[PDB]
Amino acid sequence: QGQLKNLPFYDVLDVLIKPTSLVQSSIQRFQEKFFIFALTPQQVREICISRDFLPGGRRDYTVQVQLRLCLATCPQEDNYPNSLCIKVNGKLFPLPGIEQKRPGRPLNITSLVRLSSAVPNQISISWASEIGKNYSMSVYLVRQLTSAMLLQRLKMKIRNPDHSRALIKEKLTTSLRVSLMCPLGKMRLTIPCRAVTCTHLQCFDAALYLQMNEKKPTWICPVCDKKAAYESLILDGLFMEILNDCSDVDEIKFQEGSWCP
Ligand SMILES: [Zn+2]
Numbered sequence: 001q002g003q004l005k006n007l008p009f010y011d012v013l014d015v016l017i018k019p020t021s022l023v024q025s026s027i028q029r030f031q032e033k034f035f036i037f038a039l040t041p042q043q044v045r046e047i048c049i050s051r052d053f054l055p056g057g058r059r060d061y062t063v064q065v066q067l068r069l070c071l072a073t074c075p076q077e078d079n080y081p082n083s084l085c086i087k088v089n090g091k092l093f094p095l096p097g098i099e100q101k102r103p104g105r106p107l108n109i110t111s112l113v114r115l116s117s118a119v120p121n122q123i124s125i126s127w128a129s130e131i132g133k134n135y136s137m138s139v140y141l142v143r144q145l146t147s148a149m150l151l152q153r154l155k156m157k158i159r160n161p162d163h164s165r166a167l168i169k170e171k172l173t174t175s176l177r178v179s180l181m182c183p184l185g186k187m188r189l190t191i192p193c194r195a196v197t198c199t200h201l202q203c204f205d206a207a208l209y210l211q212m213n214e215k216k217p218t219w220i221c222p223v224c225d226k227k228a229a230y231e232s233l234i235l236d237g238l239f240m241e242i243l244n245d246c247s248d249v250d251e252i253k254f255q256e257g258s259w260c261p
Contacts, residue, residue: 044115
């Protein structure tokens, strides 16, 4: 209870505060709760040496303290309570009526964190309750990953050319036409990719798809607009073979796994 969905661009290094119910008075609308964590000496050093270019162009800590809120039992997306107000060591953390419907995201609170092991850090959370909607907070130490990093990991996880040949033949059992260009970026595919759930043969470029979700993480497949989560992604060996053999060719027709332009 209170566990959140995995974020593909973060590695969890530690749980600083385990999922914890934000208990509400039933009588008063507005609520406030305080939480303490304390970094170890090695965690402080971890943050301090971690600075690098982030997306946006800013140099900052890539090892971060990340606060997440969600409804309360299975893994949930980030969701905020009505009138959420967060203070960290007394300083207000700006966030990036009855029906507040604004979508939650993880909060990088590192820049208000006291980078010390001798002194505890403190977080205050205020909110206004809503009937039959219960929330939970947790705080993690995370390393933010780039798209290159996700790409690399994705490479270490690729699909037999024969799998797609059987979909070709178990589909045609006229002519099956497919493009070698990215529907996202319009240039020639470099690393061809789709979700295992996708029933189409058309691929998209892994690197460019992960660059887009790095900025605005929607995880929607550009070909068919179904869910295309990071963990569902595969790289098609067949389209990789075809890419190393073609040049100046944009589209191909498959027959009963042969292929012409
Ligand atoms: Zn799709």
